[PDB]
Amino acid sequence: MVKWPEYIRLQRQKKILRMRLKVPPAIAQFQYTLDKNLAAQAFKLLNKYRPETKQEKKERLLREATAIKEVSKKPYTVKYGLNHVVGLIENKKASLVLIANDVDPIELVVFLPALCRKMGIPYAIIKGKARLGTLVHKKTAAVVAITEVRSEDKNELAKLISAVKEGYLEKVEDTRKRWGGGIMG
Amino acid sequence: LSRDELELIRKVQQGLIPDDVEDPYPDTVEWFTSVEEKMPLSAAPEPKRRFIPSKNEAKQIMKLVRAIREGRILPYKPPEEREREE
Amino acid sequence: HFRKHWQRRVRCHFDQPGKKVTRRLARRAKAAALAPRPVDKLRPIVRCPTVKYNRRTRLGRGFTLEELKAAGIPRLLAPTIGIAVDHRRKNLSEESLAANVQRLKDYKARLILFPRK
Amino acid sequence: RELQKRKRRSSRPTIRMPNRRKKALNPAGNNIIAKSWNKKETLSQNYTRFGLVAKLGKATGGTAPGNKALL
Amino acid sequence: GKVKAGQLWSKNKEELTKILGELKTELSQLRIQKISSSGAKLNKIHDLRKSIARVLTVINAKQRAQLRLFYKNKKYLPLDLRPKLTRALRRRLSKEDASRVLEKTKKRLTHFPQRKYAVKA
Amino acid sequence: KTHGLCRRCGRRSLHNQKKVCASCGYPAAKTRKYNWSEKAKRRKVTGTGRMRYLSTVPRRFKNGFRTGVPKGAR
Amino acid sequence: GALKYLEELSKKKQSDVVRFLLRVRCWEYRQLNVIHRASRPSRPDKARRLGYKAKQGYVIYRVRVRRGGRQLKYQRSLRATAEERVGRRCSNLRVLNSYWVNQDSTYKYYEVILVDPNHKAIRRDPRINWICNPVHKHRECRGLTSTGKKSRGLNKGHRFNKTRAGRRKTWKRHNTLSLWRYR
RNA sequence: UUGACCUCGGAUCAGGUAGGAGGACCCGCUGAACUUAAGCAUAUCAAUAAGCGGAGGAAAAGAAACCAACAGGGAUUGCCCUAGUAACGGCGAGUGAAGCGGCAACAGCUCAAAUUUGAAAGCUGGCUUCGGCCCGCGUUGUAAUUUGGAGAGGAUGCUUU
Ligand SMILES: [Zn+2]
């Protein structure tokens, strides 16, 4: 019959291979992702705490420059970058960690759920590194973290943390240890 | 499902069958991550830069001030002025 | 011992005096570039390793950091004022330290240091 | 060799290289050493006349009488 | 027939074109009629050929000077208007690129430069 | 005939059947050259021809590979 | 941060996670071209410690090399063969380094970090522009990479007496009859 | 329905680069036989010749996972002696170094493993009135700081541009 292109066949066969092999638990834990509602709540908070784009940064710096020509507190933003976020988790500064599920060299993030479990930081696996990228004005973002916030929504952050630790961490608690996949049947 | 996909699965699975062990796929026991680390791993001091305003932004702002004083760049106008001008 | 083709690998030395002239002119060029400075750097006195040559001493590679600190010469200024520094050597005894420290203060006693500008 | 035979029979000129050395053999400028440097004297004799040391290392051969430059 | 060079340097493009045209027509006519009784026509033919060479040289020089005046601030020039040098000389690092240093090296060279000194005998 | 004219070296050594020159190897980019024949290497060496461009390089080197015109030129 | 963890993981290549990932990747690479452009390094810790930077002018190229003997053994390493094949495909680039990424029953897969010497981002950086000099043309062909440095025996010590400065230069030095003027 | 991301392609799109020559010297790969041993096969020839690939005005090597056993030396290279010594060998033919010592020349450095996190501070292109404006790369990490005979952070008081 008709012939499919080669890279499309590679994509679909990589699908079937990654879903129907006996996957180790460290990799099989990434198939369990946040629901729609909890991801929406988390992204509402993280959209409240987005960083500034280049245009806003230059605009603000021009404003301070002309104010000097003619007082501030510490800025609170979503923290990103893999090594930076790992350093924040290790020093117990991060409060909530959101890890993308489609990092192509998956070794860069396999130790991250275990690390968050060890240091005690609440974590959740989200659908899409491109979603985390839009939040930080980049194309993609392997992981984001929130450490501290402004006063007016601290309670909200706390509730969100409790939400994931009641809504994602205990639904993952038993299946985070088990091998995934298989063709038994 | 189909025979070709299952043949591919069986090929890469036979590439990953350890037959010398009774249980090749055991449950993960969290012998390390079950205990919680209460303190940070680093005992290094925090640099004073994390408590004081930014110095790189201070240098950038002074460079901008020097640029405005030479008239090289245009000063700040609030966005409503730019809207009513254009 | 002429088993191999030694004809293709005979090195004569008819250019020995010409190479001596070249070396002397290279030293003159070094003198022209470094006009009041000596063409050589100061090097420490070291003892020869083996038991056969233990009795005699020779010139080393560079002064130890402890020797420079004891002589009163800072580490970063030393290569810029004609002293060689070797970070690998260790003193290991109070007798090489004293000798090279004496050498360094003797060098300091006979040095004319000029200001930067 | 064939190239050199070609240039011998060619009307193209022989490009003479000036003797431009990479390093100057005499100090130059308006400093003290330049106005007292004798171009017909060696390094050791010039540094002897200056009253300075030319080589800080160990003596490597015999010296002329009144060397005072090779310490 | 024979034209000096500075007179050609004074004139403009359309003028130099019309001397080019008249010299070419004269050369063509003399080449046609030169097949019989070639006497003093040979020296005139040689001088006319040299004259066409001079006129073409002057128009080419003026055109390339105008083209170089066009491309004074533009980033890319045509390959005919670029210096030849050699292939390796065109590929080596630029003087601004080769003399660049790191900031650590610049700091070390700024605060601890090579000093002037003299050991007295 | 066995051999015809070659475009590269201009000799009648291009094999009429194999279409490969016996002197230079025309379809190959590299000119055929062997170290067991010094005479063959000196019959086609750099210097046995016209030197249209390589003879102009030393004079350009002598003046520093400079551009422009002398001052006061017309 | 994370690169320390990746280095420790790369040090356990038969553990379940790394074995699973190596097999899935080997399957994909086997069905790709012999020499193919890699968008990003599969081992970022290894590429980063070998001098790879996420900057325009840096390129990864994965290459498969048939493994086994040439009982005459090929004195050339399989890693050296990989760099040479990639260096011919990318004749405008300079081979910086390379590293093992995978191995199969019939092939050994390597990733070669290359550098563009004509990009302005490389020519302006004093940390990498040494490769812009023409003495670094085809370092993989002259034994000037890491595999070349190992195979030529360029180490200090009594064990490397005949090869530490070049084997053939040492042989020519030892087989030269020096006759001086005054004999 | 629409818009990201990722991956794989097309373009006579824009800017570049490689090929060939030369090859005395240099860096690799590959690699003989005659001959000697009054025969000859181990050996020698020779890690040579031929063959293949890759540079420069030099190349290569190079700042110790070194030498040493010392009262210690101190990146690399080359000359002299070491020394026809040690070592290996139908222990025959023979093969055959190196440390130390004297000299020539000397010069040291850059990264990876750190969170800038009180602010990607970094860079390639295009447009230019050439002064500063856009798109892009990049957080799966571009600047600064640091490179283990080190270093960082605070405090401290001098000294440097
Ligand atoms: Zn031919």
XYZ file of N, CA and C (backbone and C1' of nucleotides) in Angstrom, chain H residues 109-156:
336
model
P 50.240 32.702 35.665
O 48.992 32.686 34.678
C 48.134 31.558 34.591
C 47.587 31.403 33.196
C 46.135 30.970 33.086
O 45.216 32.032 33.277
C 47.450 29.695 31.596
P 43.755 31.741 33.881
O 42.986 30.981 32.713
C 42.647 31.645 31.506
C 41.825 30.766 30.597
C 40.552 30.198 31.195
O 39.493 31.135 31.214
C 41.704 28.498 30.019
P 38.305 30.986 32.278
O 37.372 29.873 31.641
C 36.904 28.787 32.416
C 36.584 27.606 31.542
C 35.572 26.627 32.100
O 34.237 27.056 31.910
C 37.426 25.442 31.231
P 33.126 26.774 33.033
O 33.087 25.188 33.145
C 32.481 24.393 32.137
C 32.404 22.951 32.563
C 31.788 22.712 33.927
O 30.375 22.715 33.874
C 33.768 21.423 33.694
P 29.512 23.097 35.167
O 29.277 21.693 35.877
C 28.968 21.618 37.256
C 29.767 20.542 37.943
C 30.029 20.777 39.419
O 28.944 20.409 40.245
C 32.051 20.234 38.364
P 27.994 21.550 40.845
O 28.863 22.875 40.709
C 28.273 24.100 40.290
C 27.689 24.859 41.451
C 26.830 26.068 41.078
O 25.770 26.197 42.023
C 28.589 26.762 42.470
P 24.263 25.677 41.683
O 23.420 27.022 41.580
C 23.145 27.643 40.308
C 22.926 29.127 40.482
C 24.123 29.906 41.014
O 24.144 31.224 40.463
C 22.332 30.125 42.520
P 25.379 31.722 39.561
O 25.114 33.281 39.406
C 25.813 34.229 40.198
C 25.050 35.523 40.287
C 23.724 35.451 41.026
O 23.885 35.605 42.424
C 23.438 36.593 38.966
P 23.124 34.653 43.482
O 21.578 34.932 43.228
C 20.984 36.215 43.489
C 19.616 36.290 42.850
C 18.536 35.437 43.506
O 17.296 36.134 43.485
C 18.761 34.817 41.240
P 16.746 36.832 44.809
O 16.924 38.407 44.520
C 16.548 38.925 43.219
C 17.209 40.264 42.997
C 18.741 40.295 43.112
O 19.294 40.936 41.966
C 17.775 41.990 44.461
P 20.443 40.240 41.050
O 19.682 39.911 39.690
C 18.582 39.005 39.639
C 17.597 39.356 38.548
C 18.169 40.062 37.320
O 17.409 39.694 36.169
C 16.560 41.446 38.352
P 17.870 38.479 35.224
O 19.214 38.995 34.548
C 20.145 38.065 34.011
C 20.606 38.439 32.624
C 19.506 38.752 31.617
O 20.004 39.682 30.657
C 20.705 36.846 30.903
P 19.420 41.173 30.584
O 20.616 42.076 31.118
C 21.939 41.881 30.645
C 22.961 42.216 31.700
C 24.398 41.837 31.378
O 25.055 42.815 30.589
C 23.846 41.179 33.601
P 25.249 42.618 29.006
O 25.593 41.075 28.838
C 26.929 40.614 28.949
C 27.156 39.369 28.131
C 26.925 39.493 26.635
O 27.999 40.108 25.947
C 25.868 37.545 27.420
P 27.708 41.066 24.691
O 27.497 40.059 23.478
C 28.504 39.124 23.127
C 27.957 38.031 22.247
C 27.392 38.472 20.908
O 28.391 38.687 19.930
C 25.879 36.986 21.943
P 28.085 39.588 18.637
O 27.370 38.588 17.627
C 28.069 37.488 17.064
C 27.211 36.751 16.069
C 26.636 37.595 14.945
O 27.552 37.826 13.891
C 24.918 36.277 15.882
P 27.308 39.039 12.868
O 26.261 38.446 11.827
C 25.538 39.300 10.959
C 24.091 38.896 10.854
C 23.147 39.987 10.380
O 23.145 40.125 8.973
C 22.233 38.929 12.283
P 23.669 41.480 8.295
O 22.332 42.261 7.933
C 21.256 41.597 7.289
C 19.933 42.212 7.661
C 19.875 43.729 7.607
O 19.650 44.217 6.297
C 18.927 42.970 9.637
P 20.399 45.541 5.785
O 19.515 46.730 6.369
C 18.116 46.780 6.136
C 17.431 47.725 7.092
C 18.052 49.105 7.218
O 17.677 49.972 6.162
C 17.580 48.253 9.372
P 18.756 50.412 5.056
O 18.864 51.989 5.238
C 19.945 52.565 5.956
C 19.491 53.138 7.274
C 20.392 54.197 7.885
O 20.207 55.483 7.317
C 19.821 52.609 9.538
P 21.151 55.977 6.113
O 21.570 57.458 6.521
C 22.334 57.702 7.697
C 22.098 59.093 8.229
C 22.279 59.244 9.735
O 22.742 60.560 10.030
C 20.043 59.745 9.156
P 24.236 60.784 10.576
O 24.375 59.717 11.749
C 25.647 59.204 12.127
C 25.508 58.022 13.053
C 26.816 57.337 13.444
O 26.744 56.898 14.798
C 25.387 55.779 12.370
P 27.897 57.322 15.834
O 27.121 57.579 17.200
C 26.218 58.671 17.335
C 25.098 58.340 18.288
C 24.918 56.848 18.564
O 24.362 56.700 19.873
C 22.960 57.685 17.594
P 24.309 55.261 20.642
O 22.774 54.777 20.479
C 21.708 55.749 20.656
C 20.448 55.287 19.960
C 19.595 54.248 20.704
O 18.221 54.534 20.479
C 20.154 53.416 18.597
P 17.081 53.936 21.438
O 16.075 53.256 20.405
C 15.873 51.831 20.382
C 15.347 51.394 19.035
C 14.870 49.952 18.962
O 13.521 49.810 19.416
C 16.253 50.437 17.093
P 12.929 48.361 19.823
O 12.424 47.774 18.434
C 11.873 46.473 18.369
C 12.155 45.802 17.051
C 12.411 44.313 17.136
O 11.220 43.564 17.269
C 14.030 45.308 15.733
P 11.093 42.472 18.435
O 11.472 41.114 17.701
C 10.870 40.794 16.460
C 11.781 39.982 15.577
C 12.376 38.729 16.189
O 11.466 37.651 16.293
C 14.050 39.881 15.001
P 11.469 36.744 17.617
O 12.860 35.970 17.556
C 13.078 34.950 16.595
C 14.545 34.722 16.329
C 15.299 33.891 17.349
O 15.084 32.501 17.189
C 16.578 35.791 16.775
P 15.080 31.532 18.466
O 16.612 31.446 18.891
C 17.586 30.908 18.010
C 18.962 30.952 18.619
C 19.094 30.319 19.990
O 19.215 28.910 19.931
C 20.218 32.404 19.958
P 18.409 27.993 20.967
O 18.906 28.497 22.390
C 20.217 28.210 22.854
C 20.545 29.022 24.078
C 19.611 28.830 25.258
O 19.893 27.659 26.003
C 19.937 31.132 24.899
P 18.748 26.559 26.235
O 18.649 26.442 27.818
C 18.815 27.595 28.632
C 18.420 27.344 30.060
C 16.947 27.022 30.268
O 16.805 26.157 31.389
C 17.475 29.043 31.377
P 15.924 24.823 31.259
O 16.943 23.740 30.698
C 18.223 23.556 31.288
C 19.086 22.625 30.471
C 19.677 23.222 29.194
O 20.947 22.623 28.948
C 18.353 21.362 28.641
P 22.302 23.390 29.333
O 21.902 24.928 29.280
C 22.177 25.717 28.128
C 22.747 27.065 28.492
C 24.176 27.040 29.025
O 24.888 28.195 28.589
C 22.722 27.942 30.669
P 26.429 28.064 28.162
O 26.814 29.508 27.622
C 26.656 29.846 26.255
C 26.372 31.314 26.088
C 27.321 32.260 26.806
O 28.544 32.475 26.126
C 25.106 32.908 27.254
P 29.875 32.805 26.961
O 29.563 34.203 27.656
C 30.020 34.491 28.969
C 29.741 35.922 29.353
C 30.549 36.462 30.518
O 31.859 36.852 30.153
C 28.284 37.033 30.820
P 33.116 36.354 31.015
O 32.899 37.021 32.443
C 33.000 38.423 32.623
C 32.571 38.828 34.009
C 33.334 38.187 35.156
O 34.565 38.833 35.423
C 31.014 38.065 35.585
P 35.878 37.972 35.748
O 35.538 37.256 37.125
C 35.366 38.002 38.320
C 35.041 37.101 39.480
C 35.961 35.910 39.657
O 37.165 36.249 40.317
C 33.713 35.205 39.842
P 38.551 35.606 39.839
O 38.388 34.058 40.165
C 38.343 33.602 41.507
C 38.142 32.112 41.582
C 39.084 31.263 40.750
O 40.363 31.123 41.336
C 36.873 30.457 40.522
P 41.674 31.028 40.417
O 41.735 29.496 40.003
C 41.720 28.477 40.996
C 41.866 27.097 40.404
C 42.903 26.949 39.287
O 43.537 25.680 39.412
C 40.810 26.195 38.526
P 45.078 25.577 39.837
O 45.014 25.089 41.345
C 44.116 24.060 41.737
C 44.626 23.324 42.946
C 44.898 21.833 42.731
O 46.122 21.355 43.332
C 43.308 22.130 44.475
P 47.031 22.166 44.393
O 47.834 23.255 43.545
C 48.111 24.572 44.038
C 48.836 24.610 45.372
C 49.790 25.790 45.573
O 49.740 26.202 46.936
C 50.952 23.782 45.917
P 49.028 27.578 47.349
O 47.497 27.178 47.523
C 46.464 28.115 47.271
C 45.904 27.948 45.884
C 44.703 28.809 45.539
O 45.036 30.143 45.204
C 44.257 26.600 44.901
P 44.430 31.365 46.054
O 42.856 31.238 45.866
C 42.259 31.350 44.583
C 40.892 30.719 44.559
C 39.804 31.448 45.326
O 39.277 32.568 44.639
C 39.725 29.168 45.874
P 38.889 33.901 45.447
O 37.402 33.636 45.944
C 36.411 33.132 45.063
C 35.250 32.546 45.824
C 34.549 33.488 46.786
O 33.613 34.326 46.134
C 34.937 31.406 47.844
P 33.478 35.869 46.547
O 32.693 35.832 47.929
C 31.427 35.200 48.041
C 31.007 35.082 49.482
C 31.206 36.333 50.317
O 30.139 37.250 50.158
C 32.073 34.467 51.480
P 30.263 38.747 50.710
O 29.722 38.636 52.203
C 29.832 39.727 53.098
C 30.288 39.275 54.461
C 31.183 40.249 55.201
O 30.447 41.255 55.866
C 32.127 38.087 55.292
P 30.746 42.799 55.562
O 31.839 43.189 56.650
C 31.670 42.824 58.012
C 32.994 42.562 58.683
C 34.042 43.652 58.545
O 33.854 44.704 59.474
C 35.023 41.539 58.125
P 34.258 46.212 59.098
O 35.840 46.170 58.956
C 36.667 45.963 60.091
C 38.090 45.711 59.678
C 38.733 46.821 58.871
O 39.174 47.898 59.671
C 39.169 44.748 57.833
